[PDB]
C-alpha cells in the first residue's frame, strides 16, 4: 500500500487566531535573524532571480532593514561588480533608519551560488559578501552537502544559507553539515512548474512547520521561501515558525527589478520568471524547464511594495497580541479552514472598484 | 509543530435538516434581545458603515422592528443629529406595527463609538442613544476592556454592545467586563481584507458557535456581524445561537443607505466600501486606534453593490427566508428554533447542488443572485 | 456547541465501484416499485411541474414503462381532463413496456396538496393510480392529517408524500400508512430552498437515511430531484431508491408543456420551479424558494430515456447486477475528491461534437 | 451505505523529496510491460484510433516503450499496421539507442482485441505481434476472463495484456487466469464519460494503488492507464507501483498519430475521440455511448512530448533519490494536499507570456 505520510497545509487552508492584545501594531519589534550570526531589522529577502534582485533592489530591501541576494545568472566577475555595488553605497541615516548594516556601516548583501562553484565563493568573499546562498532544486542531496562541507572548510566565518529543502529529514543533515540557515521551499513558486513536472513537493505551510522544528534543534533559522502571495501569508509563515521570507513575484513588478517598464494594452508590465525556465537558462537540472516565462503588472517602488507588506505583519501581531517575532511564534494559534471559509475570507459578493493598495 | 486547534467552518459549509413541524412560517414569532435589556421584534441590524446606515437607514430598520446602527465615520456633532433625527422620528402605527420603540414610544437607535471616545459617548447619551456600540478591529484588547469600565463607571444604565471578537476567550473578557452583548465576525464582511492582509480570522459558523457558548455562561446576546448574503445565512447564524444579525452588503443598495444611485452601463449601482479602506479613512473625522510611515494600509476595499429598491422590501425577502427556516425546522420561535436545530456539514458538491444549477435563470428572485 | 449529526454527501461526492460482472447491460432487468402495490417497468418519474408533466408528458412515460406525474398548478376540472386524456390514451409492438393497470390503461399520478380533499374525490373518480401529496415539508402535521383523511375514505388509494429528507420524517410517514416517501429537501435543478431557508439534506445522504428507515415498513423510496446525468440514477438507485424523479432533463422535450423558443440561433424551453414567482402568481409579496429559467431543446422524451435507461443498465453491468434488488445488494461506493471529479468529467480535451448523454 | 474508501487520484498527492546522491540524467527508466518483455522507458501510446497506427507505434519502440494498434479496423488492416511495424527495422542504431526490439532486432509492437475474437489473435500471431491487449471497458468480467484462457489455451507463450479493471479483485481474477499485465484505468480518460454516464469508476491513484497490491503477489506488473496530463502524474503512477503508463490525449496531437492537421481560427489541431464515441462507433456496449469526440492542439513530434515526459521522471527519481524504477517505488512517500495546495503547485499570481514545452493551464 502506499505510504502517505502526512495531510499537508498550506498558506490558504489555515488562520491565525485573534488573542487577547495588549499592544499597537505600531509598536510591535519586527527584528529577526537571518542566519546564526546575522540579523535582519525586518523579516523580507528579496529572491535571487535575475527578474528580481539585483544592486539596485538588493541596496533597497538592504536600506529598508531586510536583504537582497544577488542571483547567480551572471558571470563571476559581474556578480562581484553587482556585490561591490550594494556593499560600497553606504541625509540617509535619518531617511533609512532600519538600515541592515554590518559592522563597518555597509549594506548588507546576499549572493547565490551553485553546486561545486568554488571559484564563485572565493570571489565573493574576497568582494565582502555578507552571506553566500547555495541554491539548488533538490538542497537535500550529496552535491550540496558536500559543497556546504568545503565552504565551511575554507571560510569557518562565512554564513551560509542552503536550500531549497521541504523536510525534517532535510534540515537536519544541513543543519549536521554545519549551515547558518535552511531555505524552505519545494515547488510554491508563483512561476515554479516542479510540482506539476516531477510530482514532487511539500505545501508550503507544512513544510515550514516540519523544517522549523528539526532547525530549532540546532539553532537554525528557517527561510520561507515561495509561495507568498498577500501580507497575511508572511504573518502566517512567521507564525509557524520561519525566522525570514524569500519573496519573488510580489517584487518583480518594482522599479527597481532588472528590466525595464513595458506597456501592454495601454497597462504596465515587467517580465518575471523562474530561473528554472527555458528563457532564463539559455548540477541538478533539449531542456526540460521547471518553470515559467511570464509578466507582472508594474507597482511602484520597493519601498512601497514593502511598506504594504510590512503592515499587514503588524497588523497581525496586534490581532495576536505579539510584542515581536518570537513572541508570536509563542502566541500563535491557528485554525484549519474550508475553501468556503477562503471564500469568506476574500473580497465577496461586491464588485472592487478602487484598487487596494494591497489587495488585488 | 503548529498549535491547530479546531477545524473551523462558516455558513456554505452546513445546512439544517427539517424537522417535524406543527408551526406555519407566517406564525412563528421572531423576537430577539439585542442586549441583556434591549428587545427586538425582528433580529437584523443595519451595519455601522458610511455607505449603510445614516439616520434614514435606521429609522427604516427601527420601523420594521430591528435597528441601525449610526456609523462614527462624522464628527460628534453630526452623530449627535443622526441619533436625534431617528428619536424624533414619531397612520404610521398601522403602518409599521413591529415598530421597535423605547418607552416613550420613540425608535430606538444604536451609535458606533471607538476606543477612548469619551466625550462622543457623552454627547450620544444626551441625545438619547438607545446603545452604544464599542467598534474595534479587535476587541479583545485592553484599549476596548478599559473603554467598557470607563463607559460602565460613567453610565451603569447604557446598554453597551462591544466587538469584533471571533474566540471564546475574548468573549468571556468582554462578558467580564461588563457588556451588554458581544459582536462576532473577524474577517467575514463582504468588504473585509483583514483576513487576507493580517493572516487572522475564524470562519463564521464556528465564531459564533464558541462565542455563543461563552457569552450564555453570562446570559449575554451574541451579534453575528458580516458574511451574509442570502436569507439562509440568518438563518444558520440564529439557529447557532446567535440572538441578531448585523448586515452590510444587502443593505447597502436600498433607497435608504447614504449615498446616491448612479448607472454604470444600463444598471444602477451605489457605492459600498469597508469603513477600514482607504476612502473611508481618508476622512479626517475618522480616529483609529488599533488601526491607526506615511501612507495606510487599508483592512477593505471600495466598491459597488446593485440598487435593490427600499429597505423594507429587503427585510421582507430575509424575514421571508428566517419563517421559511424556522417552519421546516418546526420552531416556534427564536429560542426553540436554537433548542432544535441540528446541523450537516455538506461538500463543495452538496453546495453546488444547493443553488441554481444546470439552468440559465432568465427571470430575476427577489431573494436569490 | 453545534450540533452537526453528520457529514453530508451526494452524487458527485461518490462512484460505484465495479465488481465481477456475468450480465450484459442490454440483458439486466429494470422493472421497480413506484409503491408497495404499483410496479414500473423503468424507475424513471417526470415531475409534477408545469413545464415538465401534463397528459402528452405523462402518456409518453407510461408508454415507455415508468410514470408521469401531472401537476396540481390548475384548477381541479383541468387535472381531472389531464388524467383523462391519460387514461382514455389507451402501439403495443411499438411500446413493448407499457405500464397499465388491470385494465390495459396507461398508468398516471397526479399531485394534490394539504388538505385538497375535493381535488383528491375527483381525481379518484378520474381513475388517478396513485396521488402525489406534495409538500415543500412533508414532515409536517398538515402532510400527515391528509395522509389519514385520504386512506381513510379512500383505503385502496395508492399515495405517495413527500418531500422528506431524514429518517425519522420516513417513520412518521411511514407510520402513518403511505405507500412511498418522496426524498429530496433543496436538491432540485431550480431550487433555492437551501439558500433562501438554510434547510436541506445532500441528496446521496438523504436517499440513504430514509431508505434504511422505510425499508423496515416495506415503503419504497422515491429520489427526487438533482439528476444531472444517467448516472445519478445509477448511484440513486444503488443507494437504495427505487425510483427516481427527474425535472430539468425531462422539460427541454416535445412532450413538456410550453412553446420551443429560439434564442440566439439555439432552441429553449421554459422550465421554473414551482415555488418561483412565475409559477405562483399551504407550508410556503412573495417569498419565492425557486427560479424561472430555461434548458436547452432536447427533442423526444423517448430519446433522453433511451439515454438515461443506458447508462443505467451501463452502470449495472459494471457492479455485475441482473435486476435493480441485485444492484442495491452488489453496490459498493468510494467516496472521492473534487480532483476525482474532474477526472472523472470529460478534461484537457476540447469537445467539438456533442454527445447524447453529456453536456 | 457501503463506503469503501475515500479514494484519491493523481492532483491530490505529491511525492516528498528524499535524500539523493543520483542526477536526473543518471538514473536508469527500463522497466517491466509484462511479465516476459521489458521496455527502456515505462510509456505506451494507447490503442485508439486517433493516437496509434504503425507510424505512431514505431516511434514509440524506437524511444524505447511500446504502441498498441487500436481494433478500430479489420483484420487484414490490423495485421498490416503490425508487420509494418515489425518491418520498420546502420544510422538507425546512433539515432534510437534505446529502441525496444525483440529476439530478431525487431521494434516492438502491441496490438488490441476485444472480447471473443480468435479469429484476430490468429493473425495477430502470425503477423509476428509481441504482445496482445484484450481490451474491454469492463476487464473483470466473465466473456474476459474466458478469453484469456482460451487464448493461453491456444498460444501459452503469448504475452497477454487485460483490462481495463480499477479493484484488487479483479486483478486478483485476471492474474489467477494467467495474464502477463493488468491494465488499470475505469474512467480517468480525458475523452472518457463512463464515471458520468454509468456512475463507476475508481480515482486513478488509488485505483493503481489497491491493483499493483494485489498483482504484485503474482509477479504481474500493473499498466496505469488514462488520465495522465503532465509529466508529474507519471512519475506519480509508477512511484505508487505501476510499471508503466498508458497515454492517449498527449499524444494525439502529434505528427505520427492518424489523421491530419486542421487550422481553427489561426492554430493547429488534431482530432481526438474516445473509442466508446458516437464518431468511434459509427460485447459489454441509438447508441449510448462512453466518450466524446473532440480536439487537442498539434504538439509537434512524439519524440519532443516524450523527451519531456521522460525528463519530467527523470527529475522525480532525482528528487527522490532513486536510481531506478523499483528503487523509486521503494523510497516513494507521498503527501495528500487541499486544493489550495494543488492551487500552489500550478502557476499562480502572473500571467505567462511563453509557452513552456512541458507545461499548459
Ligand atoms: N523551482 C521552483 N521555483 C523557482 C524557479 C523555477 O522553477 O524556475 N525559479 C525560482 N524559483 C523559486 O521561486 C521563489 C519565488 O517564489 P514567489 O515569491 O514568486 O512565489 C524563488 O525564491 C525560488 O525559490
Ligand atoms: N474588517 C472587516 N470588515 C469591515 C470593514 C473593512 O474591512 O474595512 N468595514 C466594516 N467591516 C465589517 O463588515 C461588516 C459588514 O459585512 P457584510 O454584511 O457586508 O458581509 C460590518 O458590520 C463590519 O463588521
Ligand atoms: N423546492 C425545491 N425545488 C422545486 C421547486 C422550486 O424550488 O420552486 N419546484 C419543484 N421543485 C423540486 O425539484 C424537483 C426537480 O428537480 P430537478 O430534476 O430539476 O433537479 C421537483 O420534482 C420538485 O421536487
Ligand atoms: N472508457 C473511458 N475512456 C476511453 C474511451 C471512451 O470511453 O470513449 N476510449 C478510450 N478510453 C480510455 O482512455 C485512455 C486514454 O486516456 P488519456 O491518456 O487521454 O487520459 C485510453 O487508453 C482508454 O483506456
Ligand atoms: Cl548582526
Ligand atoms: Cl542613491
Ligand atoms: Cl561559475
Ligand atoms: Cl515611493
Ligand atoms: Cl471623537
Ligand atoms: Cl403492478
Ligand atoms: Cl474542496
Ligand atoms: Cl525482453
Ligand atoms: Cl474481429
Ligand atoms: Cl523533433
Ligand atoms: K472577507
Ligand atoms: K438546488
Ligand atoms: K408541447
Ligand atoms: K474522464
Ligand atoms: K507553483
Do not use: W
Not at 23 to 31: A, S
Not at 107 to 125: F, K, S, T, W
Not at 190 to 202: E, N, P, Q
Amino acid at each position: 500500500a502506499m505510504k502517505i505520510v502526512k495531510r499537508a497545509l498550506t498558506f490558504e487552508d489555515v488562520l491565525l487566531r485573534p488573542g487577547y492584545s495588549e499592544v499597537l501594531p505600531k509598536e510591535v519589534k519586527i527584528h529577526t535573524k537571518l542566519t546564526k550570526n546575522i540579523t535582519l531589522n525586518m523579516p523580507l529577502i528579496s529572491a535571487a532571480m535575475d527578474t528580481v534582485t539585483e544592486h539596485r533592489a538588493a541596496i533597497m530591501m538592504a536600506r529598508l532593514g531586510g536583504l537582497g541576494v544577488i542571483h547567480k545568472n551572471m558571470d563571476i566577475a559581474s556578480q562581484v561588480r553587482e556585490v561591490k555595488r550594494v556593499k560600497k553605497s553606504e541625509k540617509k541615516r535619518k531617511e533609512y533608519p532600519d538600515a541592515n548594516k554590518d559592522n563597518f556601516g555597509r549594506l548588507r548583501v546576499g549572493a547565490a551560488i551553485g553546486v561545486g562553484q568554488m571559484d564563485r565563493v572565493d570571489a565573493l568573499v574576497e568582494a565582502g559578501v555578507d552571506v553566500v546562498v547555495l541554491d539548488s532544486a533538490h538542497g537535500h542531496s550529496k552535491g550540496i552537502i558536500d559543497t556546504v562541507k568545503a565552504i565551511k572548510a575554507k571560510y569557518p566565518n562565512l554564513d551560509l544559507i542552503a536550500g531549497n529543502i521541504a523536510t525534517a529529514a532535510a534540515a537536519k543533515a544541513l543543519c549536521e553539515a554545519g549551515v547558518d540557515a535552511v531555505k524552505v521551499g519545494i515547488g510554491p513558486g508563483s512561476i515554479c512548474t516542479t510540482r506539476i513536472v516531477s510530482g514532487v513537493g511539500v505545501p508550503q505551510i507544512s513544510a515550514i512547520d516540519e523544517c522549523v522544528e528539526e532547525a530549532n534543534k540546532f539553532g537554525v533559522p528557517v527561510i520561507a521561501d515561495g509561495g507568498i502571495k498577500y501580507s497575511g501569508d508572511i504573518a502566517k509563515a512567521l507564525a509557524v515558525g520561519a525566522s525570514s521570507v524569500m519573496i519573488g513575484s510580489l517584487l518583480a513588478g518594482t522599479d527597481e527589478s532588472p528590466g525595464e517598464l513595458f506597456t501592454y494594452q495601454g497597462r504596465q508590465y515587467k517580465s518575471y520568471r523562474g530561473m528554472g525556465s527555458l528563457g532564463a537558462m539559455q548540477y541538478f537540472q533539449k531542456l526540460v524547464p521547471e518553470g515559467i516565462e511570464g509578466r507582472v503588472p508594474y507597482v511602484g517602488s520597493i519601498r512601497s511594495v514593502v511598506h504594504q507588506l510590512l503592515g499587514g505583519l503588524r497588523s497581525s501581531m496586534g490581532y495576536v497580541g505579539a510584542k515581536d517575532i518570537e513572541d508570536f511564534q509563542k502566541r500563535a494559534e491557528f485554525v484549519e479552514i474550508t475553501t468556503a471559509g477562503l471564500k469568506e475570507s476574500h473580497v465577496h459578493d461586491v464588485t472592487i472598484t478602487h484598487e487596494a493598495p494591497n489587495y488585488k
